[PDB]
Amino acid sequence: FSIDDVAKQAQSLAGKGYETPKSNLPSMKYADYQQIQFNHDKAYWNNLKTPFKLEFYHQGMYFDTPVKINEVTATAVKRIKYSPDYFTFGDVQHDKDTVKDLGFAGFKVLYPINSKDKNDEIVSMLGASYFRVIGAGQVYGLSARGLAIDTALPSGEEFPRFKEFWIERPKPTDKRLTIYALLDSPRATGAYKFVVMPGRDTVVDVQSKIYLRDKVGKLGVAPLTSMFLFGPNQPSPANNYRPELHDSNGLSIHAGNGEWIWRPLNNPKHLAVSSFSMENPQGFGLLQRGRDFSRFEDLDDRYDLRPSAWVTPKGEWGKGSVELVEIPTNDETNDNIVAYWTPDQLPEPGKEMNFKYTITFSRDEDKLHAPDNAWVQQTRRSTGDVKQSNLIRQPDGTIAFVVDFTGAEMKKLPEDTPVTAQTSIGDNGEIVESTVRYNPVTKGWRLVMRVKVKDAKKTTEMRAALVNADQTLSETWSYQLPANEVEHHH
Ligand code: NA
């Protein structure tokens, strides 16, 4: 069994009219749902000699369609049948006749990633083509997807879904788990081979074969979905003991031409789409830079322990854009950040597309960056004059940003190193002041940029990179001041 077996099924589906899935759920309040729990004593492979274990999700609410799950042993492909016996329901029905047409909603993978005597979750595959992944000592944060379609387009995003999985039984000695997945969507289908490698960083190897059943406005490859409520770049308007609240705070990109770009995330008042056009992207990911607990202070959610996800393409992906979508949100309950690679041109429907890449879920951001290129540790917004601290100061139309850089090589540079800053700003803004100074506390350099906005109702974009005389010392801080962000009222 290989990806070809799945691809064959994908190609077939792509050559026929799309079959809209039909709900198979009978009569549910969320409270009741939370009562349906998987009997940990029923973990798949709990009887096998293998560190990996499987658990399943039960249908209910908006998980109104099932996914088929098969196990791939050395000699056979066995369909893992759904049974209410895998779960405990307590208060809910679950009659062997009321759950007759039910199947699994999704599945999770367990592994002793933290300690030998505990099978902790490391992967969760549930809903559309979404899945969550974590490394050692981490807590669930951002999600990845098998594919994204027409995201942020006025015509409406199309959400493909994984309808079937093939999980091969690992040898007792295996440290990796292979998962195959069949993806179906109104205008697209696909075949995936996932290879999950748990560790300090849990790395997922991805190979896919996508087929368009019909042309689409936008194809999102290797998508990531996260959440950003507020942070020092745009602090919470309402009092909150939490200084920050987010699963990611920036989009990191290693451009086709070698430049490193860092786009701090926002929670704009209006839908924001940012496109970084390039050819052959070397890498991109939604990162969580700054993991000291004091940035978050939340003991229940532990944002400080949530993974950064870095996508590394295998091969040349050609012309397209690493796109960032920021959605207005008032709550941390719904993800508002999306990132992906979207190709400029697509081949004719039915034509096969091959994408190979790895997704690294890590807490070692410094290791997800080139050592000889400084990165932005944090971005702090402040009123125009950074020297001023008066509490009743009236807006003077100007705004400032304190951007702190640090890095392996930078930490060694001498204090008196004449570090300069190459800046730039869009037509809607003007750079009033731009200074760089050494930070003896961090052993890095601090940039203070003050800019004035011409029209607060329009978007304002600026860029800055630390340079030396002989070279470029840091990634390019690429910031966007959302429209209506610095507007005063009432
Ligand atoms: Na602190």
Curated annotation (Swiss-Prot):
Pathway field: Glycan metabolism; osmoregulated periplasmic glucan (OPG) biosynthesis
Coarse class of the protein's main subcellular location: periplasm
Keyword Signal appears in the UniProt entry: yes
Gene Ontology BP, a term: beta-glucan biosynthetic process
GO CC aspect terms: outer membrane-bounded periplasmic space
Highest taxon, organism lineage: Bacteria
One Pfam family cited in the UniProt record for this chain: MdoG
Keyword field: Periplasm, Signal
An annotated Gene Ontology molecular function: catalytic activity
Domain notes: Contains a large N-terminal domain that would serve as the catalytic core subunit, and a smaller C-terminal domain that would act to modulate this enzymatic activity.
Purpose: Involved in the biosynthesis of osmoregulated periplasmic glucans (OPGs).
Family assignment from sequence similarity: Belongs to the OpgD/OpgG family.
Family annotation (PANTHER family): GLUCANS BIOSYNTHESIS PROTEIN (PTHR30504), GLUCANS BIOSYNTHESIS PROTEIN G (PTHR30504:SF4)
Protein name, entry field: Glucans biosynthesis protein G
Species of origin: Escherichia coli (strain K12)
Species lineage: Bacteria, Pseudomonadati, Pseudomonadota, Gammaproteobacteria, Enterobacterales
